[PDB]
Design an enzyme around this catalytic site. Structure first.
Site, short mmCIF file in Angstrom:
data_model
loop_
_atom_site.label_atom_id
_atom_site.label_comp_id
_atom_site.label_asym_id
_atom_site.label_seq_id
_atom_site.Cartn_x
_atom_site.Cartn_y
_atom_site.Cartn_z
N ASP A 44 -34.06 -36.94 23.02
CA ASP A 44 -32.63 -37.17 23.11
C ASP A 44 -32.29 -37.76 24.47
O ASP A 44 -32.58 -37.14 25.50
CB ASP A 44 -31.84 -35.87 22.93
CG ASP A 44 -30.34 -36.13 22.95
OD1 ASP A 44 -29.83 -36.65 21.93
OD2 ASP A 44 -29.71 -35.88 24.00
N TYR A 49 -27.13 -40.65 31.47
CA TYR A 49 -28.07 -39.78 32.17
C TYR A 49 -28.80 -40.51 33.29
O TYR A 49 -29.39 -39.84 34.15
CB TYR A 49 -29.09 -39.16 31.21
CG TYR A 49 -28.49 -38.32 30.09
CD1 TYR A 49 -27.17 -37.87 30.13
CD2 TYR A 49 -29.26 -37.98 28.99
CE1 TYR A 49 -26.64 -37.15 29.08
CE2 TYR A 49 -28.74 -37.25 27.93
CZ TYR A 49 -27.43 -36.84 27.98
OH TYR A 49 -26.91 -36.13 26.91
N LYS A 78 -27.07 -42.75 23.15
CA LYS A 78 -25.64 -42.55 23.00
C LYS A 78 -24.89 -43.62 23.78
O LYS A 78 -25.25 -43.95 24.92
CB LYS A 78 -25.20 -41.17 23.50
CG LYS A 78 -26.14 -40.03 23.07
CD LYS A 78 -25.61 -38.66 23.40
CE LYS A 78 -26.66 -37.58 23.23
NZ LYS A 78 -27.66 -37.56 24.33
N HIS A 111 -20.98 -41.11 22.20
CA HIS A 111 -21.25 -39.93 23.02
C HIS A 111 -20.08 -38.95 23.02
O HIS A 111 -20.27 -37.73 22.96
CB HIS A 111 -21.63 -40.38 24.44
CG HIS A 111 -22.42 -39.39 25.22
ND1 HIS A 111 -23.34 -39.78 26.17
CD2 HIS A 111 -22.41 -38.04 25.21
CE1 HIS A 111 -23.85 -38.69 26.71
NE2 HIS A 111 -23.32 -37.62 26.14
N1 LIG Z 1 -24.01 -34.95 23.48
C1 LIG Z 1 -23.63 -34.40 24.63
O1 LIG Z 1 -22.51 -34.57 25.11
C2 LIG Z 1 -24.62 -33.52 25.34
C3 LIG Z 1 -24.18 -32.57 26.26
C4 LIG Z 1 -25.09 -31.67 26.80
C5 LIG Z 1 -26.42 -31.75 26.45
N2 LIG Z 1 -26.83 -32.72 25.61
C6 LIG Z 1 -28.30 -32.87 25.29
O2 LIG Z 1 -28.82 -31.59 25.01
C7 LIG Z 1 -29.92 -31.32 25.92
C8 LIG Z 1 -30.08 -29.85 26.14
O3 LIG Z 1 -28.92 -29.29 26.80
P1 LIG Z 1 -28.88 -28.98 28.37
O4 LIG Z 1 -29.74 -29.92 29.13
O5 LIG Z 1 -27.44 -28.91 28.71
O6 LIG Z 1 -29.45 -27.50 28.53
P2 LIG Z 1 -30.47 -26.47 27.83
O7 LIG Z 1 -31.47 -27.23 27.05
O8 LIG Z 1 -29.65 -25.44 27.17
O9 LIG Z 1 -31.09 -25.79 29.13
C9 LIG Z 1 -31.89 -26.56 30.06
C10 LIG Z 1 -32.22 -25.64 31.20
O10 LIG Z 1 -33.04 -24.55 30.73
C11 LIG Z 1 -34.25 -24.49 31.46
N3 LIG Z 1 -35.30 -24.08 30.56
C12 LIG Z 1 -35.86 -24.85 29.56
N4 LIG Z 1 -36.77 -24.22 28.85
C13 LIG Z 1 -36.81 -22.95 29.42
C14 LIG Z 1 -37.59 -21.82 29.13
N5 LIG Z 1 -38.51 -21.78 28.16
N6 LIG Z 1 -37.40 -20.73 29.90
C15 LIG Z 1 -36.49 -20.77 30.88
N7 LIG Z 1 -35.69 -21.78 31.24
C16 LIG Z 1 -35.91 -22.85 30.46
C17 LIG Z 1 -34.43 -25.88 32.06
O11 LIG Z 1 -35.23 -25.78 33.26
P3 LIG Z 1 -36.37 -26.85 33.68
O12 LIG Z 1 -35.98 -28.20 33.14
O13 LIG Z 1 -36.39 -26.78 35.19
O14 LIG Z 1 -37.66 -26.33 33.05
C18 LIG Z 1 -32.99 -26.27 32.36
O15 LIG Z 1 -32.53 -25.66 33.56
C19 LIG Z 1 -29.58 -32.18 27.12
O16 LIG Z 1 -30.65 -32.34 28.04
C20 LIG Z 1 -29.12 -33.46 26.44
O17 LIG Z 1 -30.28 -34.15 25.97
C21 LIG Z 1 -25.97 -33.58 25.04
#
Ligand SMILES: NC(=O)c1ccc[n+]([C@@H]2O[C@H](COP(=O)([O-])OP(=O)(O)OC[C@H]3O[C@@H](n4cnc5c(N)ncnc54)[C@H](OP(=O)(O)O)[C@@H]3O)[C@@H](O)[C@H]2O)c1
Length: 316
Positions: A44, A49, A78, A111
């Site tokens: 994704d 980004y 997006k 997006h």
């Molecule tokens: N469409 C939209 O508007 C939108 C908005 C938000 C997000 N997104 C997408 O969704 C993805 C995921 O959401 P997000 O990035 O907000 O957050 P998330 O996936 O909920 O959390 C990411 C965080 O969790 C940590 N982490 C990952 N695996 C872990 C594990 N097994 N144990 C402990 N900590 C862990 C990561 O640390 P490290 O990386 O340091 O390991 C990072 O700090 C985004 O990256 C993006 O691709 C889209």
């Protein structure tokens, strides 16, 4: 638990993908390489980004190495809010394709439903601090997305952060040519989204859950915010299943027929997060996790709350 879900364009989408928001450009190439090596087939991405070039280096190297074939990958990006004008959509898509080293995207999403004034700034401001809207309505942006399908640049189109009335506006568009394939929305035990998920699923639109771990690296985190990974109630479910809390948080949306896109740049966590196809949460576990809803959002688009298309005033 099968690994892919069938979309309404006839293609299959891997239910687990790697998120890349906040992945530093100097770490995301190795993150994506590791992910592909350990089984991920869905990445994704987004222009906003600012790391698509580096994601693309990884994809291209794994294709060149013949670790995977292009047809086995499912790459999502997006269209950012400053490109909602019909004359800007193709170029925005083509910049993403160039950066990702691809000839087509598997899925391209609007997006946010909010269009902003075009220009260099991703969040263009008036002198008083408000985000400056575009006049282009989301139905015209949708028609521009449909053109990308008909030009071969994307296999599927969809939406992100659309509320149910905005999804309905797309579905009711005069002359609609392609339905959205996906609505990508925030979803986790503190924002369970029952109403919007059932609406989308009832229309054949697949839902992708973002921030499934509660985005602990979000820039605006405050200490008093609730923390999914540290919630004793969720840790207890994980302990019972001999899995990590993150693994429970990833399996949860999978069992709701959602796609889920946890982000990591840590090799060990990238591998851990994929090891979620070998255990099942019970119905009681699922209902218990759903009970933790508190309508808490990582991503509230707080600078857009007066935009006519701001999505989060509606109940859902
Ligand atoms: N469409 C939209 O508007 C939108 C908005 C938000 C997000 N997104 C997408 O969704 C993805 C995921 O959401 P997000 O990035 O907000 O957050 P998330 O996936 O909920 O959390 C990411 C965080 O969790 C940590 N982490 C990952 N695996 C872990 C594990 N097994 N144990 C402990 N900590 C862990 C990561 O640390 P490290 O990386 O340091 O390991 C990072 O700090 C985004 O990256 C993006 O691709 C889209």
């Amino acid at each position: 638990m099968a690994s892919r879900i069938l979309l309404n364009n006839g293609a299959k989408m891997p239910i687990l993908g790697l998120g890349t928001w906040k992945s530093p450009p100097g770490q995301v190439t190795e993150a994506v390489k590791v992910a592909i090596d350990v089984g991920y087939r869905h990445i994704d991405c987004a222009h906003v980004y600012q790391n698509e070039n580096e994601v693309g280096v990884a994809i291209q190297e794994k294709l060149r190495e013949q670790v995977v074939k292009r047809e086995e990958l499912f790459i999502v990006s997006k269209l950012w809010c400053t490109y909602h004008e019909k004359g800007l959509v193709k170029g925005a898509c083509q910049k993403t394709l160039s950066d990702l080293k691809l000839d087509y995207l598997d899925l391209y999403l609007i997006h946010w439903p909010t269009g902003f004034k075009p220009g260099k700034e991703f969040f263009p401001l008036d002198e008083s601090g408000n985000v400056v809207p575009s006049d282009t309505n989301i139905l015209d942006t949708w028609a521009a997305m449909e053109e990308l399908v008909d030009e071969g640049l994307v296999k599927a189109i969809g939406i992100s952060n659309f509320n149910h009335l905005q999804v309905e506006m797309i579905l009711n568009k005069p002359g609609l040519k392609y339905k959205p394939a996906v609505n990508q929305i925030e979803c986790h035990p503190y924002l369970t989204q029952e109403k919007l998920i059932q609406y989308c699923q009832s229309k054949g639109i697949v839902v992708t859950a973002y921030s499934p771990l509660g985005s602990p690296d979000r820039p605006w985190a405050k200490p008093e915010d609730p923390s999914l990974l540290e919630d004793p109630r969720i840790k207890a479910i994980a302990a019972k299943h001999n899995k990590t809390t993150a693994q429970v948080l990833i399996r949860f949306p999978m069992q709701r027929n959602l796609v889920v896109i946890p982000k990591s740049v840590t090799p060990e966590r990238i591998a851990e997060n994929f090891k979620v196809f070998d255990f099942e949460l019970s119905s009681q576990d699922m209902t218990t996790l759903l009970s933790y809803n508190r309508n808490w959002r990582v991503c509230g688009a707080l600078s857009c709350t007066s935009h006519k298309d701001y999505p989060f005033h509606e109940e859902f």
